[PDB]
Swiss-Prot record:
A motif (Nudix box) lies at residues 64-85. It comes from Homo sapiens (Human). Keywords: Hydrolase, Magnesium, Manganese, Metal-binding, Peroxisome, RNA-binding. The chain holds residues 14 to 209 of 238 of the full protein. It catalyses: hexanoyl-CoA + H2O = hexanoyl-4'-phosphopantetheine + adenosine 3',5'-bisphosphate + 2 H(+); octanoyl-CoA + H2O = S-octanoyl-4'-phosphopantetheine + adenosine 3',5'-bisphosphate + 2 H(+); butanoyl-CoA + H2O = S-butanoyl-4'-phosphopantetheine + adenosine 3',5'-bisphosphate + 2 H(+); decanoyl-CoA + H2O = decanoyl-4'-phosphopantetheine + adenosine 3',5'-bisphosphate + 2 H(+). This is Peroxisomal coenzyme A diphosphatase NUDT7. It is an enzyme of class 3 (hydrolase). The modification N6-succinyllysine is found at residue 7. Its EC number is 3.6.1.-, 3.6.1.77.
């Protein structure tokens, strides 16, 4: 099946907890995969304009590890719950992708999670201005704008709203699309 095939692909790239004990300032992100209309999508947030770091930018759910977290995956799930109401029973964490090093002292660990078909986002307005889906296949043929660095523009055909996706967020989306969608029969 589509979902079993995605999970099998994702598992081959799982680094596990290899890098997780290293003494960094630690953040986790959840790359939430949603199946709608026979296709996989990624769920993104738009960060509230109130937030000090990167207000109004497109981001994956996630945030800073805290002492309650049993592990890095727990960080991602806690933060996703806080931001979009995703409950742990509504997500299956399939793997841990390559961590992202930033600012010399920070390590961001991404987890890919399969999201339950009955999940409905409940954006928490103190953290998140918007939640939206992008079909995973979009990231194979994105609409690219150069601002000099590359920015994706995605227009939701449901409402015509255009979102700009960039940076680590755009990078991770492409990675996940390659992993899951490369070399598939039609
Ligand atoms: C320092 O670099 C990063 C650290 C954390 C994150 C993830 C994140 O904070 N996501 C979020 C938070 C609030 C609302 N929506 C999404 C991304 C980059």
């Amino acid at each position: 099946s589509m979902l079993d095939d995605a999970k099998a692909r994702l598992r081959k790239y799982d680094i596990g907890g290899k890098y997780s004990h290293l003494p960094y300032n630690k953040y986790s992100v959840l790359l939430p995969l949603v199946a709608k209309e026979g296709k996989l999508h990624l769920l993104f947030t738009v960060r509230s304009e109130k937030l000090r770091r990167a207000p109004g930018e497109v981001c994956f759910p996630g945030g800073k590890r805290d002492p309650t977290d049993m592990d890095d995956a727990a960080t991602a799930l806690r933060e996703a719950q806080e931001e979009v109401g995703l409950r742990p029973h509504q997500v299956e964490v399939v793997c841990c992708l390559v961590p992202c090093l930033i600012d010399t002292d920070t390590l961001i660990t991404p987890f890919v999670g399969l999201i339950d078909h009955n999940f409905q986002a409940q954006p928490n307005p103190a953290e998140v201005k918007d939640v939206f889906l992008v079909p995973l296949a979009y990231f194979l043929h994105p609409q690219v704008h150069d601002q000099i660095n590359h920015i994706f523009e995605y227009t939701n055909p449901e409402d015509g709203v255009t979102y700009q996706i960039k940076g680590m967020t755009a990078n991770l989306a492409v990675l996940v699309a390659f992993i899951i969608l490369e070399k598939k029969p039609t």
